[PDB]
Amino acid sequence: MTEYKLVVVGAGCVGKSALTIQLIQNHFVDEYDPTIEDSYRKQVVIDGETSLLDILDTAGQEEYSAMRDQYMRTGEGFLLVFAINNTKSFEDIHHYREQIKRVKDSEDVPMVLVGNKSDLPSRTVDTKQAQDLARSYGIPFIETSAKTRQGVDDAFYTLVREIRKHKE
Amino acid sequence: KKLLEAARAGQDDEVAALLAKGADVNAHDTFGFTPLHLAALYGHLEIVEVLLKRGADINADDSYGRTPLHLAAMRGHLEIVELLLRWGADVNAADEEGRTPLHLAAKRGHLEIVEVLLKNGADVNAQDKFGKTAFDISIDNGNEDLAEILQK
Ligand SMILES: Nc1nc2c(ncn2[C@@H]2O[C@H](COP(=O)(O)OP(=O)(O)O)[C@@H](O)[C@H]2O)c(=O)[nH]1
Ligand SMILES: [Mg+2]
């Protein structure tokens, strides 16, 4: 097999932990601790090849961590998450992408834009802005919902497919 | 519910009042975190002592199979690790991936916690569900001090 490093980044209370737990365990957690940062491992078959994925569920940037920095400097794929009903999270995506590019020397870093909480009828951000931003960055954009599990696997599979493209 | 928030925040008088009021010491949220879990994770030694003396469970698991010793080792709280060890916590527990607290401590890079866990007695070569040991983690990270401690 091959090991693919996937790093989930974004603002707070956007649903990173919910998405990671939904992928790993196929179960939606109503409430999770906002400070726990941990690495999970899964073995999945994409297209016609089996592989192993290790995912770091980032919590924040409050204190320096050696493991988090090592993952940031080594992780290949990045999942930039934001919530549709909050616009500050959407604004922070530029800063997150700039930080990722700066730490990773910004050659061909593969990233995927993710819109979570798409099962709520109230939203301040529309698909037009997110799609335009994703096309400006030249990265795929996927809408996700951790409650209905729509797009949970599609986002990670698109990220690994983009990772394969960078190596190829 | 009030006990969980009081333990997470770090309130001594509130926790004592809730315990004297009849709040259960083994309450858990959706994932499975107990007041001892949160107190060990956030670093409130006095609350951990009070909960242990009250009759809490020291080998309780969450939905991923992690014990309070796992959280204490992954955060870097030495005193809480020692206190949990002195009351009989399983030093060789395994989560849903079969990760010993030694694995978490070695991956984070907490050399002192590694030394304490080794002194309390724990096998160096334990394989998880993915065929990995602490020495392999040290090789992957490349830390010289961790490899020196493990090989000796
Ligand atoms: N309705 C809905 N709620 C969500 C979704 N994702 C996350 N949440 C809620 O957001 C809350 C906090 O999310 P959290 O897991 O802490 O995200 P994190 O802070 O990035 O780790 C949780 O209590 C979830 O109930 C979603 O897709 N739909
Ligand atoms: Mg989280």
Numbering used by the authors:
A (entry chain B): 1 to 168
B (entry chain A): 169 to 320
What text does the study give?
For imaging experiments, we investigated three different sequence variants of KRAS—single site mutants G12V, G12C, and G13C—in their GDP-bound forms. Following similar data processing as before, we obtained a 3-D density map showing a resolution of 2.5 Å for the entire particle and 2.9 Å for the KRAS protein. Given the cryo-EM density map and the amino acid sequences for the DARPin and KRAS proteins, ModelAngelo was able to build, de novo, a correct and nearly complete atomic model using default parameters (164 out of 166 residues for KRAS and 150 out of 157 for the DARPin). Our refined structure of the G13C mutant overlaps with a previous X-ray crystal structure with an rms deviation of only 0.5 Å over protein backbone atoms. The region around the bound GDP cofactor further emphasizes the atomic interpretability.
A potential workaround to the size limitation in cryo-EM is to bind a small protein of interest (the “cargo”) to a much larger carrier (the “scaffold”) in order to make it large enough to visualize readily. Analogous to antibodies, sequence variations in the nonconserved loop regions of a DARPin protein can be selected in the laboratory in order to obtain a variant that binds nearly any protein of interest.
